[PDB]
PDB file of C-alpha atoms in Angstrom:
ATOM      1  CA  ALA A   1      11.105 -19.297 -27.340  1.00 21.12           C
ATOM      2  CA  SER A   2       7.766 -18.993 -25.399  1.00 23.28           C
ATOM      3  CA  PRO A   3       8.676 -15.387 -24.928  1.00 24.94           C
ATOM      4  CA  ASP A   4       5.762 -15.580 -21.767  1.00 24.47           C
ATOM      5  CA  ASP A   5       8.061 -17.356 -19.536  1.00 24.17           C
ATOM      6  CA  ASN A   6      10.915 -14.163 -19.969  1.00 21.90           C
ATOM      7  CA  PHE A   7       8.429 -11.619 -17.616  1.00 16.62           C
ATOM      8  CA  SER A   8       5.511 -13.262 -15.254  1.00 17.32           C
ATOM      9  CA  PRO A   9       1.782 -13.115 -15.401  1.00 20.70           C
ATOM     10  CA  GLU A  10       1.158 -10.005 -13.595  1.00 22.33           C
ATOM     11  CA  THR A  11       3.560  -8.329 -15.737  1.00 22.98           C
ATOM     12  CA  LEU A  12       1.928 -10.003 -18.953  1.00 20.02           C
ATOM     13  CA  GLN A  13      -1.401  -8.508 -18.079  1.00 15.18           C
ATOM     14  CA  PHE A  14       0.390  -5.184 -16.675  1.00 14.69           C
ATOM     15  CA  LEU A  15       1.964  -4.552 -20.753  1.00 16.13           C
ATOM     16  CA  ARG A  16      -0.885  -5.926 -22.390  1.00 15.55           C
ATOM     17  CA  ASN A  17      -3.615  -3.426 -20.857  1.00 14.84           C
ATOM     18  CA  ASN A  18      -1.073  -0.226 -20.787  1.00 14.31           C
ATOM     19  CA  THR A  19       0.826  -0.740 -23.952  1.00 13.54           C
ATOM     20  CA  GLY A  20      -1.179  -3.292 -25.946  1.00 16.33           C
ATOM     21  CA  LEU A  21       1.546  -5.370 -26.901  1.00 15.03           C
ATOM     22  CA  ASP A  22       2.115  -8.653 -25.981  1.00 13.50           C
ATOM     23  CA  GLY A  23       4.827 -11.507 -24.678  1.00 12.45           C
ATOM     24  CA  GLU A  24       5.921 -12.236 -28.235  1.00 17.18           C
ATOM     25  CA  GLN A  25       6.177  -8.270 -29.073  1.00 21.07           C
ATOM     26  CA  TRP A  26       7.663  -7.222 -25.567  1.00 20.91           C
ATOM     27  CA  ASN A  27      10.744 -10.354 -26.169  1.00 22.01           C
ATOM     28  CA  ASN A  28      11.198  -9.136 -29.374  1.00 25.11           C
ATOM     29  CA  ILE A  29      11.644  -5.317 -28.611  1.00 24.23           C
ATOM     30  CA  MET A  30      14.027  -6.270 -25.615  1.00 24.45           C
ATOM     31  CA  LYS A  31      16.017  -8.538 -28.130  1.00 28.02           C
ATOM     32  CA  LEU A  32      16.545  -5.582 -30.405  1.00 26.84           C
ATOM     33  CA  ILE A  33      17.502  -2.726 -27.176  1.00 30.48           C
ATOM     34  CA  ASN A  34      19.444  -5.440 -24.949  1.00 35.55           C
ATOM     35  CA  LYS A  35      22.076  -6.040 -28.480  1.00 37.67           C
ATOM     36  CA  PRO A  36      23.223  -2.269 -28.138  1.00 38.66           C
ATOM     37  CA  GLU A  37      23.041  -2.102 -24.683  1.00 39.79           C
ATOM     38  CA  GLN A  38      24.604  -5.602 -23.621  1.00 38.10           C
ATOM     39  CA  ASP A  39      25.851  -6.875 -26.990  1.00 37.65           C
ATOM     40  CA  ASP A  40      23.760 -10.222 -25.499  1.00 37.66           C
ATOM     41  CA  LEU A  41      20.059 -11.230 -26.810  1.00 38.61           C
ATOM     42  CA  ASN A  42      19.655 -13.250 -23.884  1.00 39.98           C
ATOM     43  CA  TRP A  43      18.260 -10.160 -22.266  1.00 38.31           C
ATOM     44  CA  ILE A  44      16.513 -11.952 -19.054  1.00 40.40           C
ATOM     45  CA  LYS A  45      19.870 -12.350 -17.255  1.00 39.28           C
ATOM     46  CA  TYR A  46      19.960  -8.693 -17.033  1.00 39.63           C
ATOM     47  CA  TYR A  47      16.981  -8.946 -14.460  1.00 34.39           C
ATOM     48  CA  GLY A  48      19.949  -9.459 -12.172  1.00 34.77           C
ATOM     49  CA  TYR A  49      22.616  -7.214 -13.393  1.00 33.00           C
ATOM     50  CA  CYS A  50      24.446  -5.119 -11.187  1.00 33.79           C
ATOM     51  CA  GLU A  51      27.750  -3.320 -11.570  1.00 32.23           C
ATOM     52  CA  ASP A  52      29.477  -0.135 -10.244  1.00 33.01           C
ATOM     53  CA  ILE A  53      30.803   1.122 -13.600  1.00 31.22           C
ATOM     54  CA  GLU A  54      32.938   3.920 -11.791  1.00 31.80           C
ATOM     55  CA  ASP A  55      30.742   6.410 -13.128  1.00 32.29           C
ATOM     56  CA  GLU A  56      29.870   8.514 -10.069  1.00 28.90           C
ATOM     57  CA  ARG A  57      26.221   7.000 -10.072  1.00 30.24           C
ATOM     58  CA  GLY A  58      26.373   4.429  -7.533  1.00 32.50           C
ATOM     59  CA  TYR A  59      25.337   0.899  -8.776  1.00 33.17           C
ATOM     60  CA  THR A  60      23.660   0.254 -12.364  1.00 35.32           C
ATOM     61  CA  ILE A  61      20.945  -2.144 -11.994  1.00 34.61           C
ATOM     62  CA  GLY A  62      18.641  -4.128 -14.088  1.00 35.60           C
ATOM     63  CA  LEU A  63      17.595  -3.603 -17.695  1.00 36.69           C
ATOM     64  CA  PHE A  64      17.189  -0.148 -18.289  1.00 39.58           C
ATOM     65  CA  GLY A  65      20.250   1.231 -16.477  1.00 41.48           C
ATOM     66  CA  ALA A  66      18.360   2.466 -13.219  1.00 39.30           C
ATOM     67  CA  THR A  67      21.121   3.768 -10.949  1.00 39.77           C
ATOM     68  CA  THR A  68      21.550   3.608  -6.863  1.00 41.02           C
ATOM     69  CA  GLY A  69      22.558   7.139  -6.948  1.00 43.48           C
ATOM     70  CA  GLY A  70      25.957   9.236  -6.168  1.00 44.63           C
ATOM     71  CA  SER A  71      27.476  12.571  -6.945  1.00 46.13           C
ATOM     72  CA  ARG A  72      26.875  12.662 -10.798  1.00 47.95           C
ATOM     73  CA  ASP A  73      23.377  11.031 -10.326  1.00 47.10           C
ATOM     74  CA  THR A  74      21.245  12.439  -7.589  1.00 47.18           C
ATOM     75  CA  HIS A  75      18.092  11.737  -9.072  1.00 45.65           C
ATOM     76  CA  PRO A  76      18.565   8.168  -9.967  1.00 45.87           C
ATOM     77  CA  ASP A  77      15.350   5.957 -10.553  1.00 45.43           C
ATOM     78  CA  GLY A  78      16.956   2.948  -8.174  1.00 43.50           C
ATOM     79  CA  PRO A  79      14.980   4.482  -5.092  1.00 44.42           C
ATOM     80  CA  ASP A  80      11.917   4.035  -7.694  1.00 44.96           C
ATOM     81  CA  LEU A  81      13.020   0.482  -8.372  1.00 44.55           C
ATOM     82  CA  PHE A  82      13.258  -0.860  -5.032  1.00 43.98           C
ATOM     83  CA  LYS A  83       9.848   0.753  -3.556  1.00 48.26           C
ATOM     84  CA  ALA A  84       8.169  -0.958  -6.558  1.00 51.70           C
ATOM     85  CA  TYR A  85      10.006  -4.067  -5.345  1.00 52.06           C
ATOM     86  CA  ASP A  86       8.622  -3.472  -1.644  1.00 51.09           C
ATOM     87  CA  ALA A  87       5.012  -2.847  -3.205  1.00 49.83           C
ATOM     88  CA  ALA A  88       5.268  -5.731  -5.121  1.00 46.84           C
ATOM     89  CA  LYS A  89       5.888  -8.018  -2.059  1.00 49.42           C
ATOM     90  CA  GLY A  90       2.709  -6.100  -0.610  1.00 47.52           C
ATOM     91  CA  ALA A  91       3.813  -3.763   1.736  1.00 47.18           C
ATOM     92  CA  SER A  92       1.077  -1.303   2.632  1.00 50.31           C
ATOM     93  CA  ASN A  93       3.829   1.699   3.043  1.00 51.41           C
ATOM     94  CA  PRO A  94       6.215   0.228   0.192  1.00 52.69           C
ATOM     95  CA  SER A  95       9.722   2.185   0.316  1.00 56.41           C
ATOM     96  CA  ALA A  96      12.958   1.690  -1.204  1.00 53.03           C
ATOM     97  CA  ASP A  97      14.401   1.043   2.335  1.00 56.23           C
ATOM     98  CA  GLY A  98      11.623  -1.504   3.378  1.00 52.77           C
ATOM     99  CA  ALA A  99      12.661  -3.198  -0.220  1.00 52.78           C
ATOM    100  CA  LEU A 100      16.675  -3.173   1.093  1.00 49.90           C
ATOM    101  CA  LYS A 101      15.484  -4.956   4.380  1.00 52.59           C
ATOM    102  CA  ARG A 102      13.602  -7.464   2.866  1.00 52.31           C
ATOM    103  CA  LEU A 103      16.668  -8.657   0.773  1.00 52.83           C
ATOM    104  CA  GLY A 104      18.709  -8.152   4.011  1.00 52.83           C
ATOM    105  CA  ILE A 105      21.266  -4.945   2.297  1.00 52.40           C
ATOM    106  CA  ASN A 106      22.707  -2.553   4.369  1.00 53.97           C
ATOM    107  CA  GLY A 107      21.803   0.494   2.997  1.00 55.27           C
ATOM    108  CA  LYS A 108      19.660   3.492   3.258  1.00 55.78           C
ATOM    109  CA  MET A 109      17.736   6.104   1.577  1.00 57.96           C
ATOM    110  CA  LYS A 110      19.646   8.998   2.060  1.00 61.20           C
ATOM    111  CA  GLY A 111      17.858  12.474   0.543  1.00 59.66           C
ATOM    112  CA  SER A 112      17.269  11.011  -3.281  1.00 61.08           C
ATOM    113  CA  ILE A 113      19.953   8.759  -3.128  1.00 65.09           C
ATOM    114  CA  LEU A 114      20.707   5.144  -1.844  1.00 63.69           C
ATOM    115  CA  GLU A 115      23.789   4.578   0.627  1.00 63.50           C
ATOM    116  CA  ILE A 116      24.749   1.040   0.236  1.00 65.35           C
ATOM    117  CA  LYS A 117      27.002  -0.127   3.056  1.00 63.13           C
ATOM    118  CA  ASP A 118      27.725  -3.759   1.612  1.00 62.04           C
ATOM    119  CA  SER A 119      30.416  -4.364  -1.010  1.00 63.74           C
ATOM    120  CA  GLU A 120      29.478  -4.851  -4.385  1.00 63.10           C
ATOM    121  CA  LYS A 121      30.423  -8.578  -4.082  1.00 61.16           C
ATOM    122  CA  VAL A 122      27.698  -8.828  -1.725  1.00 61.61           C
ATOM    123  CA  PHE A 123      25.209  -6.070  -2.867  1.00 56.74           C
ATOM    124  CA  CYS A 124      25.026  -7.210  -6.786  1.00 55.59           C
ATOM    125  CA  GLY A 125      25.073 -11.158  -5.529  1.00 54.69           C
ATOM    126  CA  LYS A 126      21.974 -10.168  -3.817  1.00 56.03           C
ATOM    127  CA  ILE A 127      20.230  -8.551  -6.824  1.00 54.67           C
ATOM    128  CA  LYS A 128      22.126 -11.608  -9.164  1.00 56.66           C
ATOM    129  CA  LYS A 129      19.565 -13.641  -6.886  1.00 55.06           C
ATOM    130  CA  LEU A 130      16.699 -11.989  -7.899  1.00 57.26           C
ATOM    131  CA  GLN A 131      16.843 -12.843 -11.798  1.00 56.53           C
ATOM    132  CA  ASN A 132      13.634 -15.391 -11.283  1.00 55.08           C
ATOM    133  CA  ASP A 133      11.835 -13.539  -8.894  1.00 53.98           C
ATOM    134  CA  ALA A 134       8.422 -13.033 -10.081  1.00 51.84           C
ATOM    135  CA  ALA A 135       7.867  -9.716  -8.100  1.00 49.18           C
ATOM    136  CA  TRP A 136      11.733  -7.948  -9.001  1.00 43.68           C
ATOM    137  CA  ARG A 137      10.259  -8.693 -12.547  1.00 40.55           C
ATOM    138  CA  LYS A 138       6.906  -6.777 -12.188  1.00 39.03           C
ATOM    139  CA  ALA A 139       8.665  -3.883 -10.099  1.00 40.28           C
ATOM    140  CA  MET A 140      11.438  -3.778 -13.325  1.00 44.33           C
ATOM    141  CA  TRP A 141       8.522  -3.483 -15.368  1.00 45.31           C
ATOM    142  CA  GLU A 142       6.621  -0.954 -13.770  1.00 44.96           C
ATOM    143  CA  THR A 143       9.943   1.042 -13.254  1.00 47.64           C
ATOM    144  CA  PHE A 144      10.824   0.644 -16.831  1.00 47.52           C
ATOM    145  CA  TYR A 145       6.793   1.680 -17.679  1.00 46.29           C
ATOM    146  CA  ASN A 146       7.097   4.766 -15.418  1.00 47.67           C
ATOM    147  CA  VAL A 147      10.651   5.796 -16.291  1.00 47.70           C
ATOM    148  CA  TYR A 148      10.710   5.360 -20.384  1.00 48.14           C
ATOM    149  CA  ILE A 149       7.819   3.393 -21.626  1.00 47.81           C
ATOM    150  CA  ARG A 150       4.823   4.933 -20.598  1.00 48.59           C
ATOM    151  CA  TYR A 151       5.751   8.831 -22.373  1.00 51.76           C
ATOM    152  CA  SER A 152       6.796   6.242 -25.546  1.00 50.05           C
ATOM    153  CA  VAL A 153       3.314   4.695 -25.538  1.00 51.11           C
ATOM    154  CA  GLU A 154       1.793   8.464 -24.681  1.00 47.74           C
ATOM    155  CA  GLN A 155       3.857   9.757 -27.970  1.00 48.08           C
ATOM    156  CA  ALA A 156       2.614   6.815 -30.421  1.00 45.95           C
ATOM    157  CA  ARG A 157      -0.785   7.102 -29.270  1.00 45.87           C
ATOM    158  CA  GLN A 158      -1.061  10.608 -30.070  1.00 43.48           C
ATOM    159  CA  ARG A 159       0.079  10.508 -33.748  1.00 41.51           C
ATOM    160  CA  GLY A 160      -2.520   7.394 -34.164  1.00 43.06           C
ATOM    161  CA  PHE A 161       0.631   4.894 -34.131  1.00 40.97           C
ATOM    162  CA  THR A 162       0.342   1.688 -32.183  1.00 42.34           C
ATOM    163  CA  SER A 163       2.752  -0.843 -33.580  1.00 42.59           C
ATOM    164  CA  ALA A 164       5.106  -2.678 -32.090  1.00 42.43           C
ATOM    165  CA  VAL A 165       7.647  -1.079 -34.115  1.00 43.55           C
ATOM    166  CA  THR A 166       7.194   2.270 -33.689  1.00 38.79           C
ATOM    167  CA  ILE A 167       6.723   1.672 -29.556  1.00 37.42           C
ATOM    168  CA  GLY A 168       9.932  -0.091 -29.479  1.00 37.86           C
ATOM    169  CA  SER A 169      11.904   2.454 -31.424  1.00 38.81           C
ATOM    170  CA  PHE A 170      10.691   5.370 -29.219  1.00 37.30           C
ATOM    171  CA  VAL A 171      11.557   3.211 -26.156  1.00 39.20           C
ATOM    172  CA  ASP A 172      14.709   2.640 -27.226  1.00 38.60           C
ATOM    173  CA  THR A 173      15.146   6.326 -27.995  1.00 36.41           C
ATOM    174  CA  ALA A 174      14.418   7.255 -24.832  1.00 38.37           C
ATOM    175  CA  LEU A 175      15.997   4.907 -22.937  1.00 37.88           C
ATOM    176  CA  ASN A 176      19.284   5.674 -24.681  1.00 39.30           C
ATOM    177  CA  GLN A 177      19.005   9.664 -25.011  1.00 40.53           C
ATOM    178  CA  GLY A 178      16.224  10.741 -22.502  1.00 40.86           C
ATOM    179  CA  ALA A 179      12.455  10.782 -22.955  1.00 38.61           C
ATOM    180  CA  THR A 180      12.324  14.996 -22.571  1.00 36.91           C
ATOM    181  CA  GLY A 181      13.975  17.919 -22.492  1.00 34.08           C
ATOM    182  CA  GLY A 182      16.908  18.610 -25.287  1.00 36.66           C
ATOM    183  CA  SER A 183      16.535  18.439 -28.900  1.00 36.89           C
ATOM    184  CA  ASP A 184      18.459  15.337 -28.484  1.00 41.38           C
ATOM    185  CA  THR A 185      15.531  13.570 -26.711  1.00 42.44           C
ATOM    186  CA  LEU A 186      13.003  11.354 -27.711  1.00 39.53           C
ATOM    187  CA  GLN A 187      10.538  14.607 -27.456  1.00 38.93           C
ATOM    188  CA  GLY A 188      13.262  16.606 -29.389  1.00 40.15           C
ATOM    189  CA  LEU A 189      13.525  14.531 -32.419  1.00 39.37           C
ATOM    190  CA  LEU A 190       9.814  14.120 -32.540  1.00 35.94           C
ATOM    191  CA  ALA A 191       9.169  17.761 -32.997  1.00 39.43           C
ATOM    192  CA  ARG A 192      11.346  17.544 -35.507  1.00 36.17           C
ATOM    193  CA  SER A 193      10.460  14.443 -37.317  1.00 36.63           C
ATOM    194  CA  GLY A 194       7.486  16.430 -39.669  1.00 39.67           C
ATOM    195  CA  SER A 195       3.671  15.274 -39.173  1.00 36.05           C
ATOM    196  CA  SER A 196       3.208  12.734 -41.773  1.00 35.44           C
ATOM    197  CA  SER A 197      -0.048  10.208 -40.555  1.00 35.23           C
ATOM    198  CA  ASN A 198       1.004   7.435 -42.609  1.00 35.57           C
ATOM    199  CA  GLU A 199       3.122   5.476 -39.546  1.00 33.04           C
ATOM    200  CA  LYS A 200       5.692   4.209 -42.528  1.00 32.59           C
ATOM    201  CA  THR A 201       7.016   7.729 -43.487  1.00 29.65           C
ATOM    202  CA  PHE A 202       6.801   9.094 -40.109  1.00 29.18           C
ATOM    203  CA  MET A 203       9.264   6.071 -38.820  1.00 31.97           C
ATOM    204  CA  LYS A 204      11.306   6.723 -41.721  1.00 33.23           C
ATOM    205  CA  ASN A 205      11.708  10.576 -41.025  1.00 33.27           C
ATOM    206  CA  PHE A 206      12.014   9.833 -37.508  1.00 34.56           C
ATOM    207  CA  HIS A 207      14.798   7.367 -37.748  1.00 32.67           C
ATOM    208  CA  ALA A 208      16.755   9.407 -40.548  1.00 29.79           C
ATOM    209  CA  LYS A 209      16.572  12.390 -37.651  1.00 32.72           C
ATOM    210  CA  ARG A 210      17.634  10.610 -34.984  1.00 30.36           C
ATOM    211  CA  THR A 211      20.440   8.871 -37.026  1.00 29.02           C
ATOM    212  CA  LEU A 212      22.677  12.343 -36.919  1.00 28.65           C
ATOM    213  CA  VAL A 213      22.402  12.652 -32.907  1.00 31.32           C
ATOM    214  CA  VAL A 214      22.917   8.951 -32.160  1.00 29.42           C
ATOM    215  CA  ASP A 215      26.439   8.559 -32.921  1.00 29.64           C
ATOM    216  CA  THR A 216      27.464  11.244 -30.434  1.00 30.09           C
ATOM    217  CA  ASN A 217      30.007   9.700 -28.274  1.00 28.72           C
ATOM    218  CA  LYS A 218      27.927  10.216 -25.045  1.00 29.29           C
ATOM    219  CA  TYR A 219      24.929   8.235 -26.678  1.00 29.80           C
ATOM    220  CA  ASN A 220      27.021   5.301 -28.129  1.00 31.49           C
ATOM    221  CA  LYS A 221      30.513   4.581 -29.506  1.00 29.92           C
ATOM    222  CA  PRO A 222      29.913   4.827 -33.335  1.00 29.98           C
ATOM    223  CA  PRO A 223      28.892   3.221 -35.109  1.00 27.68           C
ATOM    224  CA  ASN A 224      27.030   1.099 -32.370  1.00 27.72           C
ATOM    225  CA  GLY A 225      24.385   4.519 -32.600  1.00 27.99           C
ATOM    226  CA  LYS A 226      23.979   3.858 -36.542  1.00 28.32           C
ATOM    227  CA  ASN A 227      23.618   0.071 -36.252  1.00 28.10           C
ATOM    228  CA  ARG A 228      21.068   0.392 -33.201  1.00 28.18           C
ATOM    229  CA  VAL A 229      18.874   2.706 -35.551  1.00 26.17           C
ATOM    230  CA  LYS A 230      19.571   0.636 -38.655  1.00 24.74           C
ATOM    231  CA  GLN A 231      18.147  -2.279 -36.643  1.00 25.36           C
ATOM    232  CA  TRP A 232      14.345  -0.558 -36.176  1.00 25.40           C
ATOM    233  CA  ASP A 233      14.546   1.011 -39.851  1.00 26.67           C
ATOM    234  CA  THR A 234      15.180  -2.211 -41.212  1.00 28.43           C
ATOM    235  CA  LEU A 235      11.928  -3.878 -39.870  1.00 25.03           C
ATOM    236  CA  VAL A 236      10.315  -0.467 -41.031  1.00 23.23           C
ATOM    237  CA  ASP A 237      11.338  -1.343 -44.575  1.00 25.20           C
ATOM    238  CA  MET A 238      10.703  -5.139 -44.335  1.00 25.01           C
ATOM    239  CA  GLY A 239       7.460  -4.242 -43.402  1.00 24.77           C
ATOM    240  CA  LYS A 240       7.599  -6.300 -40.202  1.00 22.58           C
ATOM    241  CA  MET A 241       6.000  -3.466 -38.082  1.00 21.60           C
ATOM    242  CA  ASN A 242       3.833  -5.664 -35.656  1.00 16.70           C
ATOM    243  CA  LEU A 243       6.892  -8.329 -34.839  1.00 20.32           C
ATOM    244  CA  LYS A 244       5.224 -11.438 -34.430  1.00 20.47           C
ATOM    245  CA  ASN A 245       6.145 -14.586 -35.906  1.00 18.20           C
ATOM    246  CA  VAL A 246       9.869 -12.924 -36.796  1.00 21.70           C
ATOM    247  CA  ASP A 247      12.210 -14.805 -35.349  1.00 22.34           C
ATOM    248  CA  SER A 248      14.555 -15.077 -38.277  1.00 20.29           C
ATOM    249  CA  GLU A 249      14.198 -11.651 -39.234  1.00 21.19           C
ATOM    250  CA  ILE A 250      15.319 -10.457 -35.242  1.00 24.02           C
ATOM    251  CA  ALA A 251      18.211 -13.014 -35.451  1.00 22.61           C
ATOM    252  CA  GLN A 252      19.214 -11.165 -39.317  1.00 23.66           C
ATOM    253  CA  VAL A 253      18.736  -7.463 -38.116  1.00 21.06           C
ATOM    254  CA  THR A 254      20.874  -8.301 -34.485  1.00 22.27           C
ATOM    255  CA  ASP A 255      23.915  -9.556 -36.920  1.00 21.79           C
ATOM    256  CA  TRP A 256      26.312  -6.970 -36.677  1.00 23.15           C
ATOM    257  CA  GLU A 257      29.506  -6.277 -34.734  1.00 22.09           C
ATOM    258  CA  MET A 258      29.126  -3.579 -31.862  1.00 21.02           C
ATOM    259  CA  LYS A 259      32.480  -1.254 -32.612  1.00 18.68           C
TER     260      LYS A 259
END
């Protein structure tokens, strides 16, 4: 195992200081999130994930579904990811354009979208190469943090909850259904989850409310949604809230067929 190698030295310091969780805990969280997202526990392979999913959002890249932008995604997070990479590489005036230049990618920021001129073969080929680039891993995590993790950690701390299971479950919810906005988002679900000060009770309630909307086709293909939340709820029932020394348990709860 040795979860630490799945990150980078600087990334672990960042995650520990801002989320209070360590390498093993984040590694376990990622296994649980990657199962319903890519049906693959080997999540580090997705640092270099790049693909045009023909959904009019440009290219989908990385671990958390960031896109480069398209007619149907005019507020993508991809530009932020690239700017973060430029920053991680030391740019004093970091920018998505600076990042593309460093990478030798023929593309530019057009408005709030990234306009890529290279073919998918060329573009994604370059992204694939970044899988073990420490700066790319750092940029990936910083962006994942700004888009979904920060808010999830804030919601947990507001309620006096700091467990790995709670944070991981909130993050899975935000990533899959959105952080804020409608009743189906992390924000919306929390508003309907009660006010129990007992972490286990609260999470059992939260998971029950999430199960009602998780299988709506737009979020997951049934019964994948029900199964993804079941993973977290099971850990709560087993009392494995700290997500440390749970390799066999994780192997057991992710043992389910997608679709």
